[PDB]
Amino acid sequence: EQCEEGWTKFQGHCYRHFPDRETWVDAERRCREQQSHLSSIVTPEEQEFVNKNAQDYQWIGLNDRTIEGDFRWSDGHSLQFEKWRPNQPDNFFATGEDCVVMIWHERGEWNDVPCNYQLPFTCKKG
């Protein structure tokens, strides 16, 4: 609506990087305590901003936890922009490789990884 204390505004939505490392479910559960979701990325400009604002490996809201191979945003947005690392997603580890991290030094490109990993994250609401 304008932008709260600790959040910063980009193209209609408000954003907050949390440095504390959490599992993907706990990160998403934290985001939802603030009426929010792990960030979805729908345009290149949003990629660049969310990467540039964090400058760190971080969870985003993309995951294939309910149907293996079928990546979806935690906030229900359709998947219309993708920026995967070479050969990803690959479901490398058969246990729980269903959650997506932004590799910040590689243009913020995405890798699917174990959801039990503990990583920083960015939340997003309107």
């Binding site: 760190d56 890798n111 990993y117």
Partner: protein, 271 residues
């Protein structure tokens, strides 16, 4: 000689590390209950028996020991007459190690420790990579003596996030891997020293930090509170300060930065 016939063609179709799904085709004629018996093949054993209702042609057996060989049999009883038993053997999968942790982190190494599996594993396969998801490194770690096994991963890139998977190994068989992540520290510049020590300027040298950084940051403090800062690109290995008090007896710190991470400090004095 079993008067009455019973259930046959027993099958174990799927097996985790502590669970087996047992399946069989039911007896043709009347039977008032079914017996399912199972236990370790290793003599020091004893069987568990469940009495099941005749409709059932399947049952999930639970709380089994990982990496162990079991016998399972199924039969029928009617009055005082037990039928023939259909029996098969099967082996539970190897369980993944539990409680992975990191101890010492440095710029180029991570110390890992985990609880040994309940199953017999002579070795652990440790598989790792940065989260950028390049090709993985692999390492066989002999089982530690106690309840625990340790290893140290070396020659890692500073300031980066690694994903690690550890599998218990006996024979050609593997448990699924257990996973965790860890961040290496950022490497520090060492041996920052004086080259010149003039009344207006100080020409510093320093041992280059290692691995990918963005820039160095020299902070210089003469008086109690007031402290100023400068930046220096990756390439550089020396800088000259220029705006200072005359012979002011500083103490100067340098640090490497990449993204949100900074390295530990280095320091010498200048007069």
């Amino acid at each position: 000689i079993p008067v009455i016939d019973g259930p046959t063609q027993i099958l174990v179709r799927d097996v985790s590390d502590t669970v087996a799904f047992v399946e069989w085709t039911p007896p043709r004629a009347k039977v008032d209950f079914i017996l399912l018996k199972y236990g370790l093949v290793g003599g020091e054993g004893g069987k568990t028996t469940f009495r099941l209702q005749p409709p059932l042609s399947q049952y999930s057996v639970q709380a089994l020991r990982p990496g162990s060989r079991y016998e399972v049999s199924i039969s029928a009883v009617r009055g005082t007459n037990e039928s023939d038993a259909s029996s098969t053997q099967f082996t539970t999968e190897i369980d993944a190690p539990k409680n992975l942790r990191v101890g010492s982190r440095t710029a180029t190494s991570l110390d890992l420790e985990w609880d040994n599996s309940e199953a017999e594993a002579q070795e652990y396969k440790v598989v790792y990579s940065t989260l950028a998801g390049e090709q993985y490194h692999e390492v066989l770690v002999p089982k530690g003596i106690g309840p625990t096994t340790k290893t140290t991963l070396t020659d890692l890139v500073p300031g980066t996030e690694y994903g690690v998977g550890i599998s218990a190994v006996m024979n050609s068989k593997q448990s699924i891997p257990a996973t965790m992540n860890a961040r290496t520290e950022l490497d520090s510049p060492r041996d920052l020293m004086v080259t010149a020590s003039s009344e207006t300027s100080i020409s510093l040298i320093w041992t280059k930090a290692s691995g990918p950084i963005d820039h160095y940051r020299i902070t210089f403090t003469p008086s109690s509170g007031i402290s100023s800062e400068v930046t220096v690109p990756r390439d550089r290995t020396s800088y000259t300060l220029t705006d200072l008090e005359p012979g002011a007896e500083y103490i100067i710190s340098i640090t490497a930065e990449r993204g949100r991470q900074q390295s530990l400090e280095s320091t010498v004095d200048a007069f």
